[PDB]
Amino acid sequence: QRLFVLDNERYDSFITQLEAPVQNAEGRERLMAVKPEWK
Amino acid sequence: EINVTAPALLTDEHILQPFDCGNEVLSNWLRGRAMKNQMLNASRTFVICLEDTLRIVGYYSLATGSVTHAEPNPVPVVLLGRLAVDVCTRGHGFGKWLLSDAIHRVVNLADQVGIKAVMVHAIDDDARAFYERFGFVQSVVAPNTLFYKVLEHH
């Protein structure tokens, strides 16, 4: 699946939760810390 | 130890047979529906190999997407469609290495074109737990669909 078509109310809930400030900041720090050693 | 090379787009000389991740679905996609989607130009598959070899040991995929209502307006996103790692690399933790590369990739992407989040569908909860340990958040699109919002670079 590549095109999520949503009813009006799911769309506003998705929109608000997307214009909301970022969440799960804790993991993002963890991910942003994973410095890989590629060769 | 296992030493791996930097994630790079799938070619046709890449060694795809010895790859064994544990889910036959995700090893089959690499064998079958990887090269095909790329010549079609839908998703792009990035693979890592064993050092000085071409034997694939892990991979991920990337396609764009959108979110709209039923009659800004389409919300521009990027789907992380597949993330898997061979069973002969375990505690080496090459999954987090691939998700780093992918996210960084999409962030550079977003400095070329407008991209508002990355999406992913968690197979099992272990996918979800991996993806929630690294920033993803439960969305409203689907109960297994998690999103990682994208902020502009610099």
Q: How many CB atoms are located within 10 Å of the residue A15 CB?
A: 16
Place of tokens 């909860």: B125
Residue A38 tokens, joined = 């590629």
Query: Is A10–B137 a contact, with Cβ atoms under 8 angstroms apart?
Result: no
Query: Is A18–B4 a contact, with Cβ atoms under 8 angstroms apart?
Result: no
Residues B83, B16: Cα–Cα separation, whole Å: 15
Structurally, chain B folds into a number of domains equal to: 1
B16 found inside a domain: yes
Residues A13, B62: Cα–Cα separation, whole Å: 25
> Contact B89/B57 with Cβ under 8 angstroms?
yes
Tell me the CATH number at B42.
3.40.630.30
B43 found inside a domain: yes
Task: Tell me if chain B has a CB within 8 Å of the CB of A38.
Answer: yes
How was this one solved?
X-ray
Residue B127 tokens, joined = 């996918």
E-state strands within B1-154:
8-9, 44-49, 56-69, 75-85, 117-121, 137-138, 145-149
B67 found inside a domain: yes
Residues B19, B129: Cα–Cα separation, whole Å: 24
Task: Tell me if chain A has a CB within 8 Å of the CB of B64.
Answer: yes
Residue B87 tokens, joined = 């069973």
Q: Which sequence positions of B are flagged as catalytic?
A: 131
Query: Is B67–A38 a contact, with Cβ atoms under 8 angstroms apart?
Result: no
Q: Which residues contact B69 (CB under 8 A, 6 or more apart)?
A: A5, A6, A7, A8, A11
